[PDB]
Curated annotation (Swiss-Prot):
Lineage, top ranks: Eukaryota, Metazoa, Chordata, Craniata, Vertebrata
PTM text: ADP-ribosylated by PARP3. Phosphorylated on serine residues. Phosphorylation by PRKDC may enhance helicase activity.
Residues the record lists as N6-acetyllysine modifications: 9, 14
Role summary: Single-stranded DNA-dependent ATP-dependent helicase that plays a key role in DNA non-homologous end joining (NHEJ) by recruiting DNA-PK to DNA. Required for double-strand break repair and V(D)J recombination. Also has a role in chromosome translocation. The DNA helicase II complex binds preferentially to fork-like ends of double-stranded DNA in a cell cycle-dependent manner. It works in the 3'-5' direction. During NHEJ, the XRCC5-XRRC6 dimer performs the recognition step: it recognizes and binds to the broken ends of the DNA and protects them from further resection.
Superkingdom classification of source: Eukaryota
Name this protein carries in UniProt: X-ray repair cross-complementing protein 5
Record-stated family: Belongs to the ku80 family.
Length: 51
């Protein structure tokens, strides 16, 4: 869950950095339709899903 918190802190930024119409639009659409972050280091991951 600690490396998992690190992976949460990474993955959202990593997918949002890749800005391609072929990919980014639909991928973040389908993400935000069901986006979720599992608890790790308290509310830090809670901030992750807050933005």
């Amino acid at each position: 869950e600690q490396r998992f918190n690190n992976f949460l802190k990474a993955l959202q930024e990593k997918v949002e950095i890749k800005q391609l119409n072929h990919f980014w639009e639909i991928v973040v659409q389908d993400g935000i339709t069901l986006i979720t972050k599992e608890e790790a280091s308290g509310s830090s991951v809670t901030a992750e899903e807050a933005k």
